[PDB]
Design a protein around this motif. Structure first.
Motif, PDB file in Angstrom:
ATOM      1  N   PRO A  23      53.298  20.111  -7.177  1.00 19.13           N
ATOM      2  CA  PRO A  23      54.300  21.044  -6.652  1.00 19.13           C
ATOM      3  C   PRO A  23      55.595  21.017  -7.456  1.00 19.13           C
ATOM      4  CG  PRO A  23      54.190  19.091  -5.274  1.00 19.13           C
ATOM      5  CD  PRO A  23      53.073  18.969  -6.273  1.00 19.13           C
ATOM      6  N   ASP A  24      56.610  21.714  -6.959  1.00 16.05           N
ATOM      7  CA  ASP A  24      57.904  21.767  -7.630  1.00 16.05           C
ATOM      8  C   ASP A  24      59.044  21.704  -6.620  1.00 16.05           C
ATOM      9  OD1 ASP A  24      59.113  22.056 -10.330  1.00 16.05           O
ATOM     10  OD2 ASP A  24      60.036  23.838  -9.435  1.00 16.05           O
ATOM     11  N   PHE A  25      60.202  21.234  -7.071  1.00 15.22           N
ATOM     12  CA  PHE A  25      61.370  21.120  -6.205  1.00 15.22           C
ATOM     13  C   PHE A  25      62.619  21.653  -6.904  1.00 15.22           C
ATOM     14  CE2 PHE A  25      58.706  17.253  -5.329  1.00 15.22           C
ATOM     15  CZ  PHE A  25      58.066  17.791  -4.230  1.00 15.22           C
ATOM     16  N   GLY A  26      63.681  21.857  -6.130  1.00 17.15           N
ATOM     17  CA  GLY A  26      64.920  22.363  -6.691  1.00 17.15           C
ATOM     18  C   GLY A  26      66.070  22.302  -5.704  1.00 17.15           C
ATOM     19  N   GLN A  27      67.211  22.860  -6.094  1.00 13.88           N
ATOM     20  CA  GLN A  27      68.390  22.865  -5.236  1.00 13.88           C
ATOM     21  C   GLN A  27      69.330  24.008  -5.609  1.00 13.88           C
ATOM     22  OE1 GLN A  27      69.249  18.720  -6.577  1.00 13.88           O
ATOM     23  NE2 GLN A  27      71.219  19.562  -7.250  1.00 13.88           N
ATOM     24  N   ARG A  28      69.749  24.773  -4.607  1.00 11.05           N
ATOM     25  CA  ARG A  28      70.648  25.899  -4.829  1.00 11.05           C
ATOM     26  C   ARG A  28      72.099  25.491  -4.587  1.00 11.05           C
ATOM     27  NH1 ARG A  28      67.993  29.553  -6.294  1.00 11.05           N
ATOM     28  NH2 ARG A  28      68.635  31.713  -6.732  1.00 11.05           N
ATOM     29  N   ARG A  29      73.018  26.417  -4.838  1.00 15.89           N
ATOM     30  CA  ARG A  29      74.440  26.155  -4.649  1.00 15.89           C
ATOM     31  C   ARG A  29      74.727  25.725  -3.214  1.00 15.89           C
ATOM     32  NH1 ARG A  29      77.666  31.856  -4.228  1.00 15.89           N
ATOM     33  NH2 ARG A  29      75.877  33.271  -3.977  1.00 15.89           N
ATOM     34  N   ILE A  30      75.989  25.415  -2.936  1.00 15.64           N
ATOM     35  CA  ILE A  30      76.394  24.990  -1.602  1.00 15.64           C
ATOM     36  C   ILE A  30      76.615  26.189  -0.687  1.00 15.64           C
ATOM     37  CG2 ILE A  30      78.071  23.696  -0.247  1.00 15.64           C
ATOM     38  CD1 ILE A  30      76.450  21.966  -2.086  1.00 15.64           C
ATOM     39  N   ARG A  31      75.744  26.337   0.306  1.00 11.55           N
ATOM     40  CA  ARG A  31      75.845  27.441   1.252  1.00 11.55           C
ATOM     41  C   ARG A  31      76.684  27.046   2.463  1.00 11.55           C
ATOM     42  NH1 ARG A  31      72.758  30.561  -1.210  1.00 11.55           N
ATOM     43  NH2 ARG A  31      72.046  32.636  -0.534  1.00 11.55           N
ATOM     44  N   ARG A  32      76.898  27.998   3.366  1.00  9.39           N
ATOM     45  CA  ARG A  32      77.685  27.749   4.567  1.00  9.39           C
ATOM     46  C   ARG A  32      76.801  27.768   5.811  1.00  9.39           C
ATOM     47  NH1 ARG A  32      83.683  30.647   4.276  1.00  9.39           N
ATOM     48  NH2 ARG A  32      84.798  28.728   3.694  1.00  9.39           N
ATOM     49  N   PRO A  33      77.300  27.168   6.901  1.00 12.58           N
ATOM     50  CA  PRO A  33      76.573  27.103   8.172  1.00 12.58           C
ATOM     51  C   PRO A  33      76.467  28.464   8.850  1.00 12.58           C
ATOM     52  CG  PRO A  33      78.794  26.258   8.450  1.00 12.58           C
ATOM     53  CD  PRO A  33      78.614  26.507   6.978  1.00 12.58           C
ATOM     54  N   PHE A  34      75.313  28.731   9.455  1.00 10.80           N
ATOM     55  CA  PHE A  34      75.085  29.998  10.141  1.00 10.80           C
ATOM     56  C   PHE A  34      74.854  29.776  11.633  1.00 10.80           C
ATOM     57  CE2 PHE A  34      71.309  29.003   7.353  1.00 10.80           C
ATOM     58  CZ  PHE A  34      70.775  28.078   8.230  1.00 10.80           C
ATOM     59  N   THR A  35      74.967  30.850  12.408  1.00 13.25           N
ATOM     60  CA  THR A  35      74.774  30.773  13.851  1.00 13.25           C
ATOM     61  C   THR A  35      73.371  31.226  14.242  1.00 13.25           C
ATOM     62  OG1 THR A  35      77.106  31.452  14.030  1.00 13.25           O
ATOM     63  CG2 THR A  35      75.842  31.269  16.080  1.00 13.25           C
ATOM     64  N   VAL A  36      72.859  30.670  15.335  1.00 18.78           N
ATOM     65  CA  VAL A  36      71.528  31.018  15.817  1.00 18.78           C
ATOM     66  C   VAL A  36      71.367  32.529  15.944  1.00 18.78           C
ATOM     67  CG1 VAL A  36      72.290  30.766  18.201  1.00 18.78           C
ATOM     68  CG2 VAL A  36      69.844  30.741  17.665  1.00 18.78           C
ATOM     69  N   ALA A  37      72.430  33.197  16.379  1.00 12.11           N
ATOM     70  CA  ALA A  37      72.409  34.645  16.542  1.00 12.11           C
ATOM     71  C   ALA A  37      72.422  35.350  15.190  1.00 12.11           C
ATOM     72  CB  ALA A  37      73.589  35.099  17.388  1.00 12.11           C
ATOM     73  N   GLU A  38      73.332  34.930  14.317  1.00 12.03           N
ATOM     74  CA  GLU A  38      73.449  35.524  12.991  1.00 12.03           C
ATOM     75  C   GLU A  38      72.143  35.381  12.214  1.00 12.03           C
ATOM     76  OE1 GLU A  38      76.376  37.228  11.686  1.00 12.03           O
ATOM     77  OE2 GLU A  38      76.481  37.213  13.881  1.00 12.03           O
ATOM     78  N   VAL A  39      71.536  34.201  12.303  1.00 12.68           N
ATOM     79  CA  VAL A  39      70.281  33.934  11.609  1.00 12.68           C
ATOM     80  C   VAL A  39      69.142  34.763  12.194  1.00 12.68           C
ATOM     81  CG1 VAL A  39      68.569  32.193  11.001  1.00 12.68           C
ATOM     82  CG2 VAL A  39      70.999  31.587  11.059  1.00 12.68           C
ATOM     83  N   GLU A  40      69.078  34.817  13.520  1.00 13.35           N
ATOM     84  CA  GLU A  40      68.037  35.576  14.204  1.00 13.35           C
ATOM     85  C   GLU A  40      68.042  37.034  13.754  1.00 13.35           C
ATOM     86  OE1 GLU A  40      66.140  35.689  17.751  1.00 13.35           O
ATOM     87  OE2 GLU A  40      67.138  33.969  18.687  1.00 13.35           O
ATOM     88  N   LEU A  41      69.209  37.665  13.824  1.00 17.97           N
ATOM     89  CA  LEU A  41      69.350  39.060  13.425  1.00 17.97           C
ATOM     90  C   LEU A  41      69.087  39.229  11.933  1.00 17.97           C
ATOM     91  CD1 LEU A  41      72.717  39.028  15.225  1.00 17.97           C
ATOM     92  CD2 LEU A  41      70.896  40.510  16.089  1.00 17.97           C
ATOM     93  N   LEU A  42      69.612  38.304  11.136  1.00 15.82           N
ATOM     94  CA  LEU A  42      69.432  38.349   9.689  1.00 15.82           C
ATOM     95  C   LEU A  42      67.953  38.288   9.322  1.00 15.82           C
ATOM     96  CD1 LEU A  42      69.576  37.952   6.716  1.00 15.82           C
ATOM     97  CD2 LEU A  42      70.567  35.681   7.063  1.00 15.82           C
TER      98      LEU A  42
END
Length: 122
Positions: A23-42
């Motif tokens: 397999p393979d692994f990696g890491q993206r930039r530093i993201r911000r925290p999201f809300t259960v609602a924001e994520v659900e709709l997104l």
């Protein structure tokens, strides 16, 4: 009385062989925290269309809130998906329920090729 200048094709046999991969692994930039609602709709925005037009995502998600950008939403899901798919020890995202990872993962595969599962046999 035998033939001359012939190809003399062989029977052609087959031998056993194994296969290996990794397999393979990696890491993206530093993201911000999201809300259960924001994520659900997104997730529903990108999921509703699976993988077509990002415009429908930003519009379907919430064409009124303080949205960011079409690609922003699409990219947000893709990232969360990779992190929700990678190893458990590496899966250290925001404090969200497994459901979010189940919906993003399931949908990802559903639109990918066929579906994810093939284990249950009622």
């Amino acid at each position: 009385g035998s033939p001359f200048a012939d190809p003399n094709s062989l029977a052609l046999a087959n031998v056993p062989l194994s296969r290996s991969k990794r397999p393979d692994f990696g890491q993206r930039r530093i993201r911000r925290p999201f809300t259960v609602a924001e994520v659900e709709l997104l997730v529903e925005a990108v999921e509703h269309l699976g993988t077509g037009r990002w415009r429908d995502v930003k519009f379907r998600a919430f064409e009124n809130v303080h949205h960011r950008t079409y690609v922003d939403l699409k990219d947000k899901w893709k990232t969360l998906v990779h992190t929700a798919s990678i190893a458990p020890q590496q899966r250290r995202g925001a404090p969200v329920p497994q459901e979010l990872l189940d919906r993003v993962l399931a949908a990802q595969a559903y639109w990918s090729v066929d579906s994810s599962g093939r284990i249950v046999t009622l």
